[PDB]
Amino acid sequence: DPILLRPVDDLELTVRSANCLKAEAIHYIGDLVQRTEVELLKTPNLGKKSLTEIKDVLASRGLSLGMRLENWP
Amino acid sequence: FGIDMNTDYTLEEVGKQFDVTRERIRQIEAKALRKLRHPSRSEVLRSFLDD
């Protein structure tokens, strides 16, 4: 997949999740489909409705958590 | 703007319809304008600009 180095607002996500992702410094797409559910959860002020946010936002293009890709960049 | 209506109301005039003092109307314009700034939201319109 060639797109995967796009920052935060590629996915049209909420200031809850965006605030938490810029706190995590997770902006590129190869890094957000790396870690799974509780791995994404353990940062503060994020929970299961933001987990449904993450689930629907990556089911809106069909990739899932488990693409722990290397040599990037 | 004047999209299927022959004005182009101003910031207070749109805020006159909803009784908002033109500040949230300006923000919700800038919120929706930032909402249309994204890729895979502006994938047809960015091509409509002469580049």
Swiss-Prot record, chain A:
Annotated region Alpha C-terminal domain (alpha-CTD): the residues are: 1-73
Q: Which residues carry this modification: ADP-ribosylarginine?
A: R16
Post-translational modification here is noted as: Acetylated on Lys-48 and Lys-49 in the presence of glucose. PatZ controls acetylation of Lys-49 but not of Lys-48. (Microbial infection) ADP-ribosylated on both alpha subunits by the phage T4 protein ModA. ADP-ribosylated on only one of the alpha subunits by the phage T4 protein Alt.
List N6-acetyllysine occurrences by residue: K48, K49
Give the family per the record.
Answer: Belongs to the RNA polymerase alpha chain family.
**According to its UniProt entry, what is the function of this protein?**
DNA-dependent RNA polymerase (RNAP) catalyzes the transcription of DNA into RNA using the four ribonucleoside triphosphates as substrates. This subunit plays an important role in subunit assembly since its dimerization is the first step in the sequential assembly of subunits to form the holoenzyme.
Subunit comment for this entry? Answer: Homodimer. The RNAP catalytic core consists of 2 alpha, 1 beta, 1 beta' and 1 omega subunit. When a sigma factor is associated with the core the holoenzyme is formed, which can initiate transcription. Both the N- and C-terminus interact with different regions of transcriptional regulator CRP. The rRNA transcription and antitermination complex (rrnTAC) consists of RNAP, NusA, NusB, NusE (rpsJ), NusG, SubB, ribosomal protein S4, DNA and precursor rRNA; S4 is more flexible than other subunits.
State the domain notes.
The N-terminal domain is essential for RNAP assembly and basal transcription, whereas the C-terminal domain is involved in interaction with transcriptional regulators (such as CRP) and with upstream promoter elements.
Protein name per UniProt: DNA-directed RNA polymerase subunit alpha
State the species of origin.
Escherichia coli (strain K12)
Q: Which gene encodes it?
A: rpoA
Query: What range of the full-length protein does this chain span?
Result: 250 to 322 of 329
